[PDB]
Amino acid sequence: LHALLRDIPAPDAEAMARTQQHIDGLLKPPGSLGRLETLAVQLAGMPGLNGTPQVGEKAVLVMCADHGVWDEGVAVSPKIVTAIQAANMTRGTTGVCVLAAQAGAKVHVIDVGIDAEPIPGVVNMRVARGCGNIAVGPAMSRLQAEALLLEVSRYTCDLAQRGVTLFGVGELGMANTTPAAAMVSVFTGSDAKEVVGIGANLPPSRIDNKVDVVRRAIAINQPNPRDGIDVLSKVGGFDLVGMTGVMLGAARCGLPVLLDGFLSYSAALAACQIAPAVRPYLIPSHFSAEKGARIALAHLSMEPYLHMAMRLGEGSGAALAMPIVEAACAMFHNMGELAASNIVLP
Amino acid sequence: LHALLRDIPAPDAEAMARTQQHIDGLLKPPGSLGRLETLAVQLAGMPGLNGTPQVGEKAVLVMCADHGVWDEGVAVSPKIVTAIQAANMTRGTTGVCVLAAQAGAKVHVIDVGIDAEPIPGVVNMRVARGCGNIAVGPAMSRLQAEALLLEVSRYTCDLAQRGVTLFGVGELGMANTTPAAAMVSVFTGSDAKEVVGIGANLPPSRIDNKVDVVRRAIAINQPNPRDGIDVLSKVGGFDLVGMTGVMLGAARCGLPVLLDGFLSYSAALAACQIAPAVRPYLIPSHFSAEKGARIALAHLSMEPYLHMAMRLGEGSGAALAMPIVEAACAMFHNMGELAASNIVLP
């Protein structure tokens, strides 16, 4: 894992410079395509993309797992929904499945800790049947976190060897906005009250309890904010650890990763804390309607492209933004040039 | 034209109700897909869509024309660029062409007043070689505005009879952010200084002159803000009138129209002033980087889905948002249902 983190490549400034020069010469006022241009340049800096903004195969990795903190009454969805929805993922009927199909991407469902019998068709990487209840102790051991980070990292990179050039990250797990809020609070130094949201339609009257649970998780575990792995293992979860591993893996293979919503922000904070070299590979998708979204995004210095007030998860926002990444590539390669039209602008 | 405006259909509330009920039953927490859900319902209310959110063929109509106010030094792009870019539109090398192709939409280039010889391959609807300089008088006569509104309206609807169900609107015309600013100022009652932007890279030192030109256009023409056609004919332009006509035409044929950037906001303000019944058919795409964008959008009560800091025009933002409209349709038709999985949520 030390080797992994050490070998994350830095962006290729040379390729980025050639990209900018080319974009500036396209048939349009310089900078007129705004963020689509900066995105194209960002992609050109990623080693796995071969010095140019391009998208080959697309994949969305969905990490599924249950949480012991569910027993604290922080979620209104039945616990079994995690298992049920993971099965639906293999049938193509879920929100991320439909959006991914629309984007021409394949969905990979990975079980990293669902509390139920193994589901056929789902990639098996389960650590245990659900993680520990963060309200009274740690979610898992540091070793369990490190092993899963490594496992997921290799899997992610291995796909790269099969033509995948763009990754999307997602999750599935009832009650996971609680550990996500705890992590955000710890990494950003914000009070729990500022970061706790309604998750999957939690009644307004039950918010206070959720805020209390988050505070207890932090007080009892005392996670070290300067150690991302310590935070993930103490107040995080298997699904959040797995999302973090996708990001470290893609970064190691020099490829881009599209974040999703609130849960993915938490994992991204952890990943950047663990290895700052990961930041250049992250691409925001949408702006989650979860309460703590603004704060999490601020500390990541990211501005989502899409404002859809979405809060489903599963990597649905990630899939929805894939066409945008392809648009930046299409702009770069298919547009004509000013010089070819004898057009000169001041 | 009176018949046209009178026959614009009202949204089908019955179909909208059936849509909501169906969306609420999909495999996800109610309302979790946010704006994607409201969009699907909006589409279901449009008569030309046959009671359901669906997208058949897609088209982007680009209105090209020159402006006499160009001589006032409000634009740094050579006047000929309008003609050159219109030709490029027929070659598929422009920004909107590339983005439209990515979205599977066809681009229609319509010349409503380019100041140059006719361009082969471009739909010919030219009113004159450029409109009058709004700084010293009106852009055109009221009759010329009304005739073009009617012409463009019929053309738009006629395409509907060929399978088009989703329209995108766009323009091309050096100096057109000046008349667009004048219109916005008049419709919203905002001072010119608050609505004038840099358009296509206008140097910061030349802004003052642009603000002055806008004020003179308004003082000299005295456009009536309660008469959208009066405003368009006095301080607008052929291209802006044509965009307005696309919106009235699509609304008349009960179909959706995707706005683009700043210029399209102006036209949309005019259209809604002329016929409020048009509003339900308009769908925002992105948030233009032009200075007066926020104000224009506020008076239209619209919140764009995309924040790309784009300011190219051509209908490029419109094309970029088409995949989003299709996503709402895909969600509606392809997702599974909660009941089928025996999932019950409070």
Ligand SMILES: O=C(O)c1ccc[n+]([C@@H]2O[C@H](COP(=O)([O-])O)[C@@H](O)[C@H]2O)c1
């Ligand atoms: O991605 C988001 O921003 C998001 C925001 C709120 C809720 N969710 C989803 O809803 C679940 C977490 O909600 P909850 O109330 O059980 O903590 C989980 O399975 C996520 O996929 C996802």
Ligand SMILES: O=C(O)c1ccc[n+]([C@@H]2O[C@H](COP(=O)([O-])O)[C@@H](O)[C@H]2O)c1
């Ligand atoms: O769509 C926008 O928001 C937009 C904002 C700024 C500039 N433009 C484009 O640039 C041109 C208008 O800029 P200008 O400086 O000549 O007034 C015109 O051809 C538009 O297509 C377009």
Ligand SMILES: c1ccc2[nH]ccc2c1
């Ligand atoms: C200068 C060059 C290309 C362009 N496309 C749209 C406006 C514009 C201005």
Ligand SMILES: c1ccc2[nH]ccc2c1
């Ligand atoms: C309840 C029902 C379906 C779901 N998909 C993702 C979270 C979730 C909760």
